[PDB]
Amino acid sequence: SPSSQKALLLELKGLQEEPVEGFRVTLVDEGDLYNWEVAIFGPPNTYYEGGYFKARLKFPIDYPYSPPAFRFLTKMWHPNIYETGDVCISILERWNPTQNVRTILLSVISLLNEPNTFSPANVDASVMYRKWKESKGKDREYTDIIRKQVLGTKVDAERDGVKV
Numbered sequence: 488s489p490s491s492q493k494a495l496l497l498e499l500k501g502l503q504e505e506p507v508e509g510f511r512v513t514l515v516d517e518g519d520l521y522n523w524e525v526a527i528f529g530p531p532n533t534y535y536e537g538g539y540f541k542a543r544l545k546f547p548i549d550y551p552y553s554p555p556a557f558r559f560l561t562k563m564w565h566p567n568i569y570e571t572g573d574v575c576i577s578i579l580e581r582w583n584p585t586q587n588v589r590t591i592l593l594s595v596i597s598l599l600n601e602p603n604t605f606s607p608a609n610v611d612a613s614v615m616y617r618k619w620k621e622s623k624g625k626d627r628e629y630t631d632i633i634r635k636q637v638l639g640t641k642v643d644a645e646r647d648g649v650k651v
């Protein structure tokens with residue numbers, strides 16, 4: 488039996504018993520231990536509030552000696568998230584056999600809340616964000632886009648029977 492199996496079943500249980508705030512973790516519908524659904528809710532008092540965003544963790548067979556891959560399925564406009572959904576996360580500071588899903592999920596919240604415009608993944612989002620912060624949020628173009636995606640997700644919430 489793969490060492491990964493037991494490490495993932497334990498990590499799944501830990502996260503369903505003590506969730507990271509805003510995240511809800513399950514397997515995909517076919518029950519593949521190695522492919523997790525991640526449901527992410529925008530927190531109150533942010534432009535993401537009321538959001539329902541979906542992402543995926545794909546784990547290798549040798550986890551935790553190699554890192555999972557993380558990808559948004561929801562389209563997202565952010566200096567650090569690619570067109571594809573892939574994400575800008577160093578720890579994927581670098582990966583260790585002692586890092587774990589809980590740390591990955593917190594480093595997503597950290598990428599979310601504080602964009603790095605130094606090495607952007609989405610260069611137009613990145614320059615549009617610097618301009619937004621420059622204006623001390625007086626300029627509405629970046630938050631217009633986020634607001635639209637957030638409202639869009641209410642369709643996904645409804646298709647999935649969630650629960651915002």
Ligand SMILES: COCC(=O)N[C@@H](Cc1ccc(-c2cc(Cl)cc(Cl)c2)cc1)[C@H](O)[C@@H](O)C(=O)O
Nearest residue numbers: 508509528529530532533534535596599600633
């Ligand atoms: C442009 O929109 C930017 C935005 O709303 N930023 C927020 C940071 C922030 C906080 C939380 C998240 C966040 C957290 C989780 Cl757990 C899920 C999601 Cl979808 C977003 C992202 C950014 C705020 O500026 C921040 O100061 C606050 O109100 O806490």
